[PDB]
Design a protein around this nucleic acid. Structure first.
Ligand code: K
Ligand code: K
Ligand code: MG
Ligand code: MG
Ligand code: MG
Ligand code: MG
Ligand code: MG
Ligand code: MG
Ligand code: MG
Ligand code: MG
Ligand code: MG
Ligand code: MG
Ligand code: MG
Ligand code: MG
Ligand code: MG
Ligand code: MG
Ligand code: MG
Ligand code: MG
Ligand code: MG
Ligand code: MG
Ligand code: MG
Ligand code: MG
Ligand code: MG
Ligand code: MG
Ligand code: MG
Ligand code: MG
Lengths: 193, 148, 99, 203, 51
RNA sequence: UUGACCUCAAAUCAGGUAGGAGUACCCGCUGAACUUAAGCAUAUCAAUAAGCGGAGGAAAAGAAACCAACCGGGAUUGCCUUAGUAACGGCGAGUGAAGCGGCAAAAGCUCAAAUUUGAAAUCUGGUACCUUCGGUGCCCGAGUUGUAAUUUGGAGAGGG
RNA sequence: GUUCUUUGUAAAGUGCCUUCGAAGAGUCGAGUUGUUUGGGAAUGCAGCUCUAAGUGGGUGGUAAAUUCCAUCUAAAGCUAA
């Protein structure tokens, strides 16, 4: 069944594929149900914003390390520097991630800053008090947006020192390539009988 | 839709456009890519040379994010500047207060040198640059600042 | 180990201000633990050697550490485990009569 | 306490003392029934590690399981298929002898819930296991919030569904690239990968 | 002397010998249980004694 | 001779519990061949049908012996992607994931290994009463071959 | 929301110094066999043989020796959407 000039196709339908066909007829019904569940959860929970405050965090994998995004939870170091304990932050609506570590002062500072902003912008009700109705806002993420850090200014002075960036890249690659060979060569030339 | 198909037109015509001698049988040449080396060899070698065999070396667990490096040619190099600022940067082509372009922020990994840019200094920040791209930037009076 | 600030080469990557996070208590899962050192020493005293450990000691004393390490790599899984076991065995030998 | 010494000593299985105890105990277990109630754990430290507590409601059962491969039960070795399936004698039963032990013990004590099990002995013919079971009807277990989770009906015959330690191991339930086939369930992953997803607005 | 899984006490003479603690292997976990108001005790120690 | 202990029994002993049905979905075991390869044996169909064991309202998974190699992410699940790609394959027919990224939902934790040792502080049951999904007193019993409190690696403990 | 209950010199959290810091074995791992996987000098699983350690152990998708580095912390457990 190889006819005239057409691309080779790879349609994987040699199993009983018709027994597993998910047609999402319930896309609209599920959207309605999700909105209903969000409304019911908002009504059920305290005048609390339906989601926890998340940290700012650098994406891995240089394809994405140029950008910043919401992480799972604030590190223990970040919570301590913001002046809370992990248990109390979890009770007042802060996501806490024991797994994440701080090796970047800029990200650590941004997270401590947004923790301080959140603490200043929330009102914690007393356990046995009155705390008059505080007009629940639904999105901590919308209240505290994640902002991409500004790396440079719009305009600057040209400072070409004659380094030839292409040559710099070539030399860095070559030096990495021949680092081990040169180290072995120096090791063998350090014989000194 | 069905009312526009040729099968409506074949109603009343016995063979349904499939012929009397060679009918519409089930799989006369085999199923799928059967016989690519034996009875479909001509249609394989023509229109698909190179199909059979191996051509290089394998790469277990290859991740495409390692090789992510979108290329931007010098021919644009200025669509990265917002349109309104572009005119006032093109005018007054000054060595001082030259526009800084973060091509990595724009989503590019290497700057190539296809086109030609105006004689306006630009500070091009990039992970990688083509040799000709860097020389053209320098000839326009700008600089390439390597970033990561 | 500071990044070079460029996208290729040995210490490639962006320069950021480092922080040196506090050491996790994990990364100390296989630590010294005086208590377990005592327990392991006492158990090694009360229960003696395994047959392969005795064979390894004989091989160390008679055929050399290389042959002993070959047999230890056969008995255990890996060469690193064989080396550690032979080191433990000749430490046992040293702690034995030939002080 | 003594449990650290027990744990370290139990690892010297080829020492003289443990070899002697192995021989005597394997003879005794072989003389007893294939499945029989054990008065107390033979390895109290291991039982504690696996979740046993010395309170009313916790039960220990010793079970003997035949060793070796799973011979294909086809008559006269005839498989009536392609030669790739003609094998009879080197087929391996993708489930542990420990799992067989817990399943048989759970069928015996169906009023209990298999919490765990551990190896105690073996000979050429048999492998010997002690199964820790919990009585979900006993009030000491229904109270004691540390253990009344096993009283929930969702935990009926967890050993039969592969929810014990050996069951999760055999099902391949672990994290990482080595368990891509079996992380969320092998058949569930296969269904998800072999499902054709069609949206209202086709993509 | 009759601890049925004996590993619970096999290390005890050597532990006592290494720590310089006088020890006696004695007949009866049941007897030690009578000592300490239990059915069986498997050990019984004196740390302080009256003058 | 008496009283224990250990192990093992018996009772229409006191009180309970299992089985069977259903089985769309779910967790496992076992397990084809038709079929495709224009023949066919590996392969494919398919880790499917049939067979067997076991649940729930969901199940399973689940708080990393993870992913990564980054300026690092951070339980699990699902969707959109990655991708018909890396890879597998009489490298033939065919097969074929995963990391990242956007999103839905978000939630975290607990035992073992510790001397309470100036006090088994723990628990089932019986019985009487009570404000009865239970409580209190008393009594047996379980339990030191370890039941409570205390700690779970993010730590944490002991002293000051 | 309102009332009789008030637990309790009980419980919990936090700063600094100091001594420690127990962390799961016929298991991990290895060989071999079978099955399986996209996992390719071997992806998982299972049988049998061997069988660990504690600055260890696992992983790091090409087998191996050597030197490092990174990242987790198995062989026990619960958990809604
Ligand atoms: K034809
Ligand atoms: K058959
Ligand atoms: Mg006609
Ligand atoms: Mg006709
Ligand atoms: Mg003809
Ligand atoms: Mg009992
Ligand atoms: Mg068999
Ligand atoms: Mg009765
Ligand atoms: Mg049933
Ligand atoms: Mg068919
Ligand atoms: Mg055919
Ligand atoms: Mg045909
Ligand atoms: Mg035929
Ligand atoms: Mg079926
Ligand atoms: Mg039901
Ligand atoms: Mg649900
Ligand atoms: Mg569940
Ligand atoms: Mg953990
Ligand atoms: Mg994740
Ligand atoms: Mg594409
Ligand atoms: Mg397949
Ligand atoms: Mg505390
Ligand atoms: Mg562990
Ligand atoms: Mg099979
Ligand atoms: Mg676990
Ligand atoms: Mg579970």
């Amino acid at each position: 069944a190889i006819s005239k000039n057409l691309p080779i196709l790879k349609n994987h339908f040699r199993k009983h594929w018709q027994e597993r066909v998910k047609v999402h007829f319930d896309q609209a019904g599920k959207k309605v149900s999700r909105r209903n569940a969000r409304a019911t959860r908002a009504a059920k929970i305290a005048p609390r914003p339906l989601d926890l405050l998340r940290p700012v965090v650098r994406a891995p994998t240089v394809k994405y390390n140029r950008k910043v995004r919401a992480g799972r939870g604030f590190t223990l170091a970040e919570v301590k520097a913001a002046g809370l304990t992990a248990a109390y932050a979890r009770t007042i609506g802060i996501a806490v991630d024991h797994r994440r570590q701080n090796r970047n002062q800029e990200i650590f500072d941004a997270n401590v800053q947004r923790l301080k902003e959140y603490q200043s912008k929330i009102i914690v009700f007393p356990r046995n008090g009155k705390a008059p109705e505080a007009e629940q806002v639904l999105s901590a993420a919308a209240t505290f947006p994640i902002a991409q850090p500004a790396t440079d200014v719009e305009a600057r002075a040209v400072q070409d020192n004659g380094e030839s960036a292409f040559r710099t890249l070539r030399l860095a690659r070559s030096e990495k390539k021949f680092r081990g060979i040169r180290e072995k060569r120096a090791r063998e030339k350090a014989e000194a009988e | 839709p069905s009312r526009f198909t040729k099968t409506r037109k074949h109603r009343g015509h016995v063979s349904a456009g499939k012929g009397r001698i060679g009918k519409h049988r089930k799989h006369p040449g085999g199923r799928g890519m059967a016989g690519g080396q034996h009875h479909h060899r001509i249609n394989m070698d023509k229109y698909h040379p190179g199909y059979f065999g191996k051509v290089g070396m394998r790469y277990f667990h290859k991740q495409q994010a390692h090789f992510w490096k979108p290329v931007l040619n010098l021919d644009k190099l200025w669509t990265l500047i917002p349109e309104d600022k572009r005119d006032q940067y093109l005018k007054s082509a000054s060595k001082e207060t030259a526009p800084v372009i973060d091509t990595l922020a724009a989503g590019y990994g290497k700057i190539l040198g296809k086109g030609r840019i105006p004689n306006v200094p630009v500070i091009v920040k990039a992970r990688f640059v083509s040799k000709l791209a860097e020389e053209k930037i320098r000839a326009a009076g700008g600089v390439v600042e390597l970033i990561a | 180990t500071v990044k070079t600030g460029i996208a290729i080469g040995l210490n490639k990557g962006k320069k950021v201000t480092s922080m040196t996070p506090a050491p996790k208590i994990s990364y100390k899962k296989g630590a010294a633990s005086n208590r377990t050192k005592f327990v392991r020493s006492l158990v090694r005293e009360i229960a003696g050697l395994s047959p392969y450990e005795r064979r390894l000691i004989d091989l160390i004393r008679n055929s050399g550490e290389k042959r002993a390490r070959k047999v230890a790599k056969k008995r255990l899984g890996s060469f690193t485990r064989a080396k550690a076991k032979v080191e433990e065995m000749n430490n046992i030998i040293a702690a034995s009569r030939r002080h | 306490g003594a449990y650290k010494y027990l744990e370290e000593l139990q690892r010297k299985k080829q020492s003289d003392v443990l070899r002697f105890l192995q021989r005597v105990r394997v003879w005794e277990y072989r003389q007893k029934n294939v499945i029989h109630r054990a008065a107390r754990p033979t390895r109290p430290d291991k039982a504690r590690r696996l979740g046993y507590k010395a309170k009313q409601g916790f039960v220990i059962y010793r079970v003997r399981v035949r060793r070796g491969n799973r011979k294909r039960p086809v008559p006269k070795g005839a498989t009536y298929g392609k030669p790739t399936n003609q094998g009879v004698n080197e087929l391996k039963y993708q489930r542990s002898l420990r799992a067989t032990a817990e399943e048989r013990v759970g069928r015996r004590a169906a009023n209990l819930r298999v919490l765990n099990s551990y190896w105690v002995n073996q000979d050429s013919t048999y492998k010997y296991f002690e199964v820790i079971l919990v009585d979900p009807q006993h009030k000491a277990i229904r109270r004691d919030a540390r253990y009344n989770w096993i009283c929930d009906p969702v935990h009926k015959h967890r050993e039969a569904r592969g929810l014990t330690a050996t069951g999760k191991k055999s099902r391949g339930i672990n994290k990482g690239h080595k368990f891509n086939n079996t992380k969320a369930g092998r058949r569930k992953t296969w269904k998800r990968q072999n499902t054709l997803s069609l949206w209202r607005y086709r993509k | 002397n009759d601890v049925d899984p004996i590993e619970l006490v096999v290390f005890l003479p050597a532990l006592c010998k290494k720590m310089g603690v006088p020890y006696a292997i004695v007949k009866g976990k049941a007897r030690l249980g009578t000592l300490v108001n239990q059915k069986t005790s498997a050990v019984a120690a004196l740390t302080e004694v009256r003058a």
